[PDB]
Design a protein around this ligand. Structure first.
Ligand code: HEM
Ligand SMILES: CC1(C)[C@@H]2CC[C@@]1(C)C(=O)C2
Ligand SMILES: [C-]#N
Length: 408
């Protein structure tokens, strides 16, 4: 049974669309495909759904880009749907607007800037090689459970100086953040609250131990960046370290599954990467354009008209990032990966002040993964008749990716 809310007075009937972000119509065919069903040639730039507590959805790339770039009009004070979950959410600095956001972002950038990420290339490569060597000779693997859920997790836990045995409990918390359980807004709110608390409980002793610490790990490094001349307060630190884990341990995992399903079905595209290593390197950003996974929100700061649509203060707008990179008004033949595509503009990492702090790390993980994968398993396919299973929410997920190849 689907929970519906009645539309508020300012939402006209002709803009209503029954879209469930947590269980999209057509999701069994794929997450991207399911969002693309929403983006029809004449569909309005903003539509309103009665599901998930009632909210807007931006349906075109130009709006998505603009909203992310405009924090004075579209605040991060709520970035999740339903509102109850968004109000429970306590991660830093994603809940902050400038100027409060800026010193926390500066602190994160001390650890995640491109020059720092470059130093990690060899470590990341070693991890990828070790995992791939476990199955390359075998001729098959279930890519989700044996690679995509393993590689980024080992990379990030190593970088954060945390034990690998914590991966399972952290993954469970992350799943309830990005796809909270429940069939009511209030239930999903409670699920998010519990997961967010679980994170805080995990990180609290780590913060206490690493304040003023001598560790070289990512957490010590970022934690000990001063905020306005003083140590970061406890409340902010909890949200900050939690966010690092949430993003670092999960988002790339999901991206890799979608990417690899496509590649498994497009041997010609894989062959291009194998034959031209620079095409692989220069083509990674096209993969980010094509396999967006985040759909999050902003809070309308003031009553306004935006793209011909009346919005009220407090309205939530969901931003399905896939609808920028895959917008046929921005990219011709948007569902094909064209490694030589010159314009790859997308909002896979969002835009504006919150534009993904981990984006250099994401790009490097994917680049290293492809290089080491193709070196050891040059050709591969999805098992005949296999059906991946898809999940939609604030971050998309996919499982059951059985690959097969002739060992080289
Ligand atoms: C495929 C990989 C990734 C994707 C698609 C992605 C996507 C995003 C998006 C869309 C945002 C903006 C959220 C918003 O403000 O509404 C974001 C922010 C962020 N991401 Fe990522 N991310 C990825 C990887 C990573 C990694 C590996 C990390 C490592 C910790 C990370 C850390 C962060 C942080 C700290 C923010 C908040 C930045 C701020 O608020 O200033 N991300 N990410
Ligand atoms: C939606 C996000 C991708 C963004 C960074 C990590 C994430 C899960 C958040 O909680 C904010
Ligand atoms: C970002 N996750």
């Amino acid at each position: 049974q689907k929970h519906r809310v009645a539309p508020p007075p300012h939402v006209p009937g002709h803009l209503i669309r029954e879209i469930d972000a947590y269980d999209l119509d057509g999701l069994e065919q794929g997450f991207h495909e399911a969002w693309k069903r929403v983006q029809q040639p004449d569909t309005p730039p903003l539509v309103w759904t009665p599901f998930t507590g009632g909210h807007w959805i931006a349906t075109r790339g130009t709006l998505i880009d603009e909203i992310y770039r405009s924090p004075e009009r579209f605040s991060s004070r709520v970035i999740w749907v339903p509102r109850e979950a968004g109000e429970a959410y306590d991660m830093v600095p994603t809940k902050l607007d400038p100027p409060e956001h800026t010193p926390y972002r500066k602190a994160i950038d001390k650890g995640l800037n491109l020059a720092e990420i470059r130093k990690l290339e060899d470590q990341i490569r070693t991890i990828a090689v070790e995992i791939i060597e476990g199955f390359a000779d075998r001729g098959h693997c279930e890519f989700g459970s044996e690679f995509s859920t393993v590689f980024p997790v080992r990379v990030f836990l190593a970088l954060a100086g945390l034990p690998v045995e914590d991966a399972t409990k952290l993954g469970l918390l992350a799943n309830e953040m990005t796809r909270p359980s429940g069939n009511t807004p209030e239930e999903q709110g409670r699920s998010l609250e519990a997961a967010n608390k679980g994170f805080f409980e995990y990180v609290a002793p780590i913060i206490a131990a690493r304040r003023g610490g001598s560790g070289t790990d990512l957490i010590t490094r970022i934690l000990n960046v001063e905020i306005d001349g003083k140590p970061m307060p406890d409340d902010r630190a909890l949200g900050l370290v939690s966010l690092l884990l949430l993003g670092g341990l999960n988002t790339v995992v999901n991206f890799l599954g979608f990417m690899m399903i496509y590649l498994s079905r497009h041997p010609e595209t894989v062959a291009e990467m194998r034959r031209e290593p620079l095409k692989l390197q220069r083509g990674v950003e096209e993969l980010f354009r094509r396999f967006a996974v985040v759909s999050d929100a902003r809070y309308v700061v003031s009553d306004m008209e935006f793209h011909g649509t009346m919005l009220k203060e407090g309205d939530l707008i969901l931003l399905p990032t896939a609808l920028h990179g895959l917008d046929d008004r921005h990219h011709d033949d948007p569902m094909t990966v064209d490694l030589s595509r010159r314009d790859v503009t997308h909002s896979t990492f969002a835009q504006g002040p919150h534009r993904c702090a981990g984006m250099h790390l994401a790009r490097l993980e994917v680049t290293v993964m492809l290089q080491e994968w193709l070196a050891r398993i040059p050709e591969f396919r999805l098992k005949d008749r296999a059906v991946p299973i898809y999940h939609s929410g604030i971050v998309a997920a996919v499982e059951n990716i059985p690959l097969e190849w002739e060992p080289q």
